[PDB]
Every structure is written in C-alpha cells, then in structure tokens.
Amino acid sequence: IDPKRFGKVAVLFGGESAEREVSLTSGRLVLQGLRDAGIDAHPFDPAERPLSALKDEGFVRAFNALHGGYGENGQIQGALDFYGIRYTGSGVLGSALGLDKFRTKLVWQQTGVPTPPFETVMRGDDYAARATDIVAKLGLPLFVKPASAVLKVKTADALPAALSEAATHDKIVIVEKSIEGGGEYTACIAGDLDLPLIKIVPTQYLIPCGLPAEQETELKRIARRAFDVLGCTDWGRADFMLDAAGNAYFLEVNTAPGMTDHSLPPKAARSIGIGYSELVVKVLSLTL
Amino acid sequence: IDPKRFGKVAVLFGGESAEREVSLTSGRLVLQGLRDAGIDAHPFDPAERPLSALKDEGFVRAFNALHGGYGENGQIQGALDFYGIRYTGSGVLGSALGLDKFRTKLVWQQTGVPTPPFETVMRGDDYAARATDIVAKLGLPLFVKPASVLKVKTADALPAALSEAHDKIVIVEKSIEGGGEYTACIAGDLDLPLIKIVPAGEFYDTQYLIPCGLPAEQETELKRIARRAFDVLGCTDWGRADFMLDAAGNAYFLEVNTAPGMTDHSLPPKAARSIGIGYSELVVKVLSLTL
Numbered sequence: 001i002d003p004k005r006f007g008k009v010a011v012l013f014g015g016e017s018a019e020r021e022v023s024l025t026s027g028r029l030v031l032q033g034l035r036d037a038g039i040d041a042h043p044f045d046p047a048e049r050p051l052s053a054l055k056d057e058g059f060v061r062a063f064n065a066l067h068g069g070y071g072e073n074g075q076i077q078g079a080l081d082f083y084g085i086r087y088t089g090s091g092v093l094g095s096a097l098g099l100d101k102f103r104t105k106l107v108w109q110q111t112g113v114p115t116p117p118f119e120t121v122m123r124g125d126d127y128a129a130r131a132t133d134i135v136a137k138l139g140l141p142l143f144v145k146p147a148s149a150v151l152k153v154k155t156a157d158a159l160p161a162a163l164s165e166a167a168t169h170d171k172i173v174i175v176e177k178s179i180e181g182g183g184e185y186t187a188c189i190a191g192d193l194d195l196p197l198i199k200i201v202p203t204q205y206l207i208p209c210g211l212p213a214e215q216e217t218e219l220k221r222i223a224r225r226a227f228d229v230l231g232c233t234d235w236g237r238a239d240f241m242l243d244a245a246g247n248a249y250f251l252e253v254n255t256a257p258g259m260t261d262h263s264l265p266p267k268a269a270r271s272i273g274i275g276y277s278e279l280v281v282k283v284l285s286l287t288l
Numbered sequence: 289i290d291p292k293r294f295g296k297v298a299v300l301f302g303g304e305s306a307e308r309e310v311s312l313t314s315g316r317l318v319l320q321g322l323r324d325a326g327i328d329a330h331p332f333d334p335a336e337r338p339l340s341a342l343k344d345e346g347f348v349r350a351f352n353a354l355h356g357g358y359g360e361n362g363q364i365q366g367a368l369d370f371y372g373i374r375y376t377g378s379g380v381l382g383s384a385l386g387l388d389k390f391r392t393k394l395v396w397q398q399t400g401v402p403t404p405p406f407e408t409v410m411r412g413d414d415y416a417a418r419a420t421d422i423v424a425k426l427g428l429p430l431f432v433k434p435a436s437v438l439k440v441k442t443a444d445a446l447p448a449a450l451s452e453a454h455d456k457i458v459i460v461e462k463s464i465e466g467g468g469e470y471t472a473c474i475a476g477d478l479d480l481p482l483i484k485i486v487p488a489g490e491f492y493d494t495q496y497l498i499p500c501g502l503p504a505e506q507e508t509e510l511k512r513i514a515r516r517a518f519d520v521l522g523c524t525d526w527g528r529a530d531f532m533l534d535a536a537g538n539a540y541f542l543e544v545n546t547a548p549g550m551t552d553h554s555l556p557p558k559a560a561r562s563i564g565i566g567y568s569e570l571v572v573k574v575l576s577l578t579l
Contacts, residue, residue, distance in 0.1 A: 078363040096380045
C-alpha cells in the first residue's frame, strides 16, 4: 500500500507499432491511475527516449502499456531483463510463446488444454491440394490465421486463395476448425482478482456472460491453466469458444491487453467494483 | 561474398555468465576470423560497453559469441531486436524455448520428434509417492533435470534427488541406455557430419569423435531429423541438436543449443574442418545468414 514501496516507476507506452495510438491512450490513463495512488510514476516512450535512460535515471520498475511489436513479443521484455528493470506481466518466454499461435496450440494439446483441431500449411505447398486434404480432415467452416487479419472460410472452393494469401504473411499458416453453435468468451487475468468472464458478441461485450455460476467458475480455472502452461504470468486474457454443449476450446492468449478506459480488463474490473486506479496498482504490485 | 556488404560488425563476447571465459576465447577467434575475411568487425563485450553504443557507433549487425545467461536466453536477442541490430542465430522465441526443457519436450512430443519419456514433479507434492510412481511408470535409471542434472540409478535415491529441487517444476527423464550419445551441428545449409560424444571413463576428458561410427544411410537420416528437432522449436540457422541412440539405433533427442562454442576445441569448427571448411569460412557463413 505505501506508494514509496514502488520507487520510481516508468510507464512504457507509445512505441513504434501499428497500435501506437491505442498504447498512447492506455499509457496516459495508467499514468493517471498510478499518480492518483501517489506512486512516483513517469511517462517513458521507448520510441522517443533511450532505453538506457531507465537505468541511468534510477527507474526501478515499469508498467508495460505497449501493445504490438516489441512491446508484446518478448523483445522489450528481454531488453528490460537485460537492463535489470522489473516490469508488469509476462516474461520473455511467455510473451514470445503467447504470440506464436502454432506453438501455443501444440503446448495446449500436450497439457490437456482443449483447443480447436487444426492443420498447418507451409508457404510453397500445393495450396489447392492441401485445401482438399484439410477440408476432408477438418470440415467447414475454417479459420485461416498466420502462425505468428484472420480469414473465415465457409466453402471448400474459397480455401486455396485464403491459404495463398495467408502464406504471403507467414511461412506457416494455421487452418483451424471453427467452433459453431455456442459462443465466444474471454477471461481477463489480473493477479488472483476474480474478474468475470466477458461474452463477445458479433464487436459488443456482455457482462454477465450468460453462463451459470458453476460453469463460469470452472472456465475461469481452466483459462488460468491455459495461460500459465505457456509461461505467461500475472496479467493478460485467454480467449475461448464454447460449443452448443458447453465444451470449451481455447483460441489464444493476450499478454498485453488494452487499458483504455473502455478496454476489457477495466470493464471486467469495473463490473465487480474495482476502479481503474485500483486495477493498475494491483497489477503493478505483482512486481514487488 | 563482398565483405563490405556486411557493414560494421560487432562480435558480442565475454558477458557475465559462468561461461564468460569460454566466450572470451570464442569471441577472440571469431573476431580474427571475420577480420581475416576483410570484414569490418570489432569486439563488443556487453559486460563492459553500454548496448546503446551499438546503435550510436553505427554497428549494423552482430556475431553472437556469448554463451549462457543473457547471451543465450533471448535477453540479448530482444535487446538487439529492440535496437534494430541484426544478429546471428535464433531470435527471441527459439532462444527462450531452447532453454526451456519442459516446453521443448512438449513441442517435440506433439510434432513427432522422438524424445525420452518423462514425468514432472511439482514441489509441491509428496516427493516420496511421486518417486515411487515415476519409477513404476518410467523405470531406471532416471535423470532429474531443471524444467526452465542428477542421474539416479536406484529407486531409494530419487525422493531425496527430487527434494533438492528450476523449482516448483522438476523434470524426471528416462535415461537412454546401451547406445551412444551424438550431436548434429547446424550452420545454414552446410552438410556438417554428426559427432559422437564419449565420456572419459569409456575412452580406453570428454572425447568428441568424427566419424561418429554410424552407417552413411543412418547418419543422413539423423541429420535430417535433428534439423527438424531444432527448427520446430523456432530455432534457426546456427546451433546443435543433441540426441542419444539406444542399442537398436532408435534416436531420442535431448536438447538444443542455440549459442554453441567457437573455440578451437569446440564442436562446430571440428565438424566444419572435417568437410574442408576452415574457421574463417564457417564464421562468414554464419554471419551471411544475417544478410
């Protein structure tokens, strides 16, 4: 509680990625929220300030409010570790593995975390021949996702152009069975806060998620397992589908979620009476 | 080819790990080998120079001759990516996963790369009961190995072996008996031969033998599978994959190394020399993959 325990804090935000503008907003609010708590927090945009200034100006820890690019892929995590600066959320492995959808799914398959069945296609494959085999094996519809803009494919005839197009963006393309007839949900994770699931509606976000309490409790538990087996910690989201029968299938994790005053973790927290400042203090307190 | 194409090159070496002295040796030889090729290469010890100096003094790429610690685990790779400096070997995912035994083996199991069966101990649990059930499930001997090394030959000695420990997660791996231990060095498309690793007590200290002693057809197939074992973890371009054979010649991969030694007694220069590729050529080949 004593804000002095946090010492001098950098709020990392902005950056060089396509999500710079969202990160500017996140970081401004995180900054406000930490200062509201009396914490000695300062803005630090690594696209503008030398990263060596963190150590040189006596910064001891950072709230990472970057999104995309080096803020989320293990790169700035590795650099912060190298410089001795503590930081929020996941470390190098968890950040890098969380962004690799292919290897995230292999680890889930080996650890009992359910995930939709999928095939891979390599750049330079006979995409038409692969498409035929994959429809025979998985059925339709399918999502075609780069391994590290997702396309939904509803007919067999549309699949080869989708593979070819995805292969332009990644040497490896994931072709994943779509889970139909249920719903889409996300579990926000912030320490051991009991944040409610959020249902994602075909763009709109719904709390309560519409599920019975016992099912919600189990799904939050499995979602935390899905996150922790990839080496992620403390802060993020796990996205998943249910089918019509209520079986869960995990899609991906997010290790750098938004902190705009309407992004999902603040919404989930506000719904249980935890305000924005309290949420950011809680997340930062995990670095103590 | 044209040395000017590499621009200004840092050789990262030294560092702060327990293997600093081997890195010092490797880095001194790599530096000389790049210079002998006419490349504009300079020493850069990150334990002594600020990493900001790379970008500030106009370095465009680095040969990573660090071993262990931040040179191998993705930390310095992330920092270099952050600074826009190209570097040899694996990037952040491959480097961090190649040091994580638990997830390395899960990925190998899900992708058909053979690896010894294993159990995890959460410490955590009753080490006495886990030890009993692991011996039942796996057999003996076992290795107790960090998840993120002790060879145990009786069931009695395991609970204590577990007690000692990463921590929270312990790997208990079946030992592969009656064959040999081997390594496959990887350097771009060089067809580097396998090397047999022979413990000092079995050589009538540790000895490295080329040729590895296996028939050509088998060696060809093992080089291919070893490259796949390295590549499925996200590692690229430069490193080793280590494996055992049992008595019948079945292979089991044990681990990868993404920052291998470059002394005159290290494995990649020996594998390369045996196919007529000298040291200077090997370092230029590795660096060329950064173009």
